[PDB]
Each structure stands twice: as structure tokens, then as C-alpha cells.
């Protein structure tokens, strides 16, 4: 129904035989190609289910936060998607405690407001040390609390690139009652994710295509244009 299979050409390429046998129903015989290869029909069905759920959630003002922490490609991806659609985002991964309670988020947003509206009148009046401290505090807030400045209630949804390397937030979400949608190839615990996406993120092109697809999925909620949902073209771009 969406994203015809002719555009998915390099959807595999995960690590060699280092996985979790909690999966397997989504995987074809492993020892036949020495790589984690997925079945594409169930892939498209899961993608359609994820699209349906995210559009249902966002239709009623469901705000989402991206999870982008890997080295180079996902950084630019999350930057582009966050600057395109008015949603919160995470630059560097959580240190714990920034998602389990709102009071810390409240003092963080208060610090951000005070800092910006005070540094608006303090840039060269005193020594370079205090101005540099103000700039460093701004940059630190961008590093950790950069995207969390437009929310008054706890985030109702979040999209994760992989449960590994982001275990803290997903564990809190298991503790919490918030639904979870995430990417996972085979190195996950499927119990911790409620909307499984068996889409491999090893190849950058597939990650870019899926991220743009989800951005367009959340785009229709706020009445903003869509770019790559039914387009008969696959995103091809040499790794930077």
C-alpha cells in the first residue's frame, strides 16, 4: 500500500551472527547467506502498521521525540528532520533521570528561558570568562536539553533508532506507561518495544528513507507538506 518494494534494495547488511534468538520469526535461514536477512512482505506490513499507529497518535496532537545519537549519519538526519518538522529531538543520549520526572525538565526549561533572555543583554560587558560561561551553558543545553523546550506534558511518543546504545530511556518507558515505537534489526529485546520495526539501520540509505517516511507520517497531522511517502524513487546517497 505504501513504499512499493521496488525501492527497498539494500534493506539488509547487519552484523555477522551477533544477534538475539528472541527474534527469528522475522528472519529467513541465517546460515544461507552469512548475514541477517529479513523477509520483505512482513517488513512492509510492519511499516504500514507503524505508519497507521503514528498517524493515529499524531492526529490527536501526539508529539514525538527522535532518538539520534550515533556517530555521523543519524546526526545530520535528525538535525534535518528536527529543523523540518516542529518536534522535539535529542542530540546526545540521555544520562538518566531526564525522562522519568517532569520537575527536572521544568527546571531545565526555566534555566533555558532565563539563560537566553539574560544573555540577550550580556555578551561583552564583563570579562570574557562569564560570557564564555554563558555560551558554554547554551551549548551544553543544546547538547542535552536542546530539543526539550516546547513540551508542557510528558512526551506521548518517541521513536528510537535502536534499543541498544539507548537502553536507559527504553527501560524507563518499560517502567512508564508510554508506548514505544523503535527500529531494531535483531540485536534487541522485542519485549521492550511495542511496535517492532525489523528495518536494518546498518545501511545509511534505508535509515534515511525510513526516517523521511516517518517525518512525512507525522507531517500530515500538523498540515504541512509531504515529500517522500508515495514517490516512485529510492533515496540514494553515497556515505559521507
Amino acid at each position: 500500500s505504501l513504499a512499493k518494494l521496488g525501492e527497498m534494495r539494500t534493506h539488509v547488511g547487519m552484523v555477522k551472527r551477533y544477534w538475539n534468538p528472541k527474534m527469528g520469526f522475522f528472519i529467513e535461514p541465517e546460515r544461507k547467506h552469512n548475514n541477517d536477512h529479513f523477509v520483505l512482505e512482513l517488513q512492509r506490513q510492519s511499516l504500514q502498521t507503524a505508519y497507521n499507529y503514528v498517524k493515529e497518535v499524531a492526529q490527536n496532537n501526539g508529539q514525538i521525540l527522535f532518538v539520534g545519537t550515533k556517530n555521523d549519519y543519524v546526526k545530520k538526519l535528525v538535525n534535518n528532520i528536527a529543523k523540518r518538522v516542529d518536534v522535539a529531538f535529542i542530540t546526545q543520549r540521555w544520562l538518566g533521570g531526564t525522562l522519568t520526572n517532569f520537575k527536572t525538565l521544568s527546571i531545565s526549561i526555566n534555566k533555558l528561558n532565563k539563560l537566553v533572555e539574560k544573555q540577550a543583554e550580556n555578551a561583552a560587558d564583563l570579562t570574557k570568562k562569564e560570557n564564555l560561561m554563558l555560551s558554554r551553558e547554551i551549548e551544553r543545553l543544546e547538547k542535552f536539553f536542546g530539543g526539550v523546550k516546547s513540551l508542557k506534558r510528558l512526551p506521548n511518543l518517541l521513536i528510537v533508532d535502536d534499543p541498544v546504545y539507548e537502553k536507559n530511556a527504553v527501560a524507563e518507558a518499560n517502567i512508564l506507561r508510554i508506548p514505544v515505537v523503535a527500529l531494531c534489526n535483531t540485536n534487541t529485546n522485542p519485549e521492550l518495544v511495542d511496535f517492532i520495526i525489523p528495518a536494518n539501520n546498518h545501511q545509511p540509505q534505508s535509515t534515511c528513507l525510513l526516517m523521511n517516511l516517518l517525518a512525512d507520517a507525522v507531517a500530515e497531522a500538523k498540515a504541512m507538506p509531504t515529500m517522500f511517502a508515495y514517490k516512485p524513487d529510492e533515496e540514494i546517497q553515497i556515505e559521507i
Partner: peptide
């Protein structure tokens, strides 16, 4: 289920 309200 869907439609998280």
C-alpha cells in the same frame, strides 16, 4: 491498541 489518547 492504537489511537493513544
Amino acid at each position: 491498541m492504537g489511537n493513544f489518547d
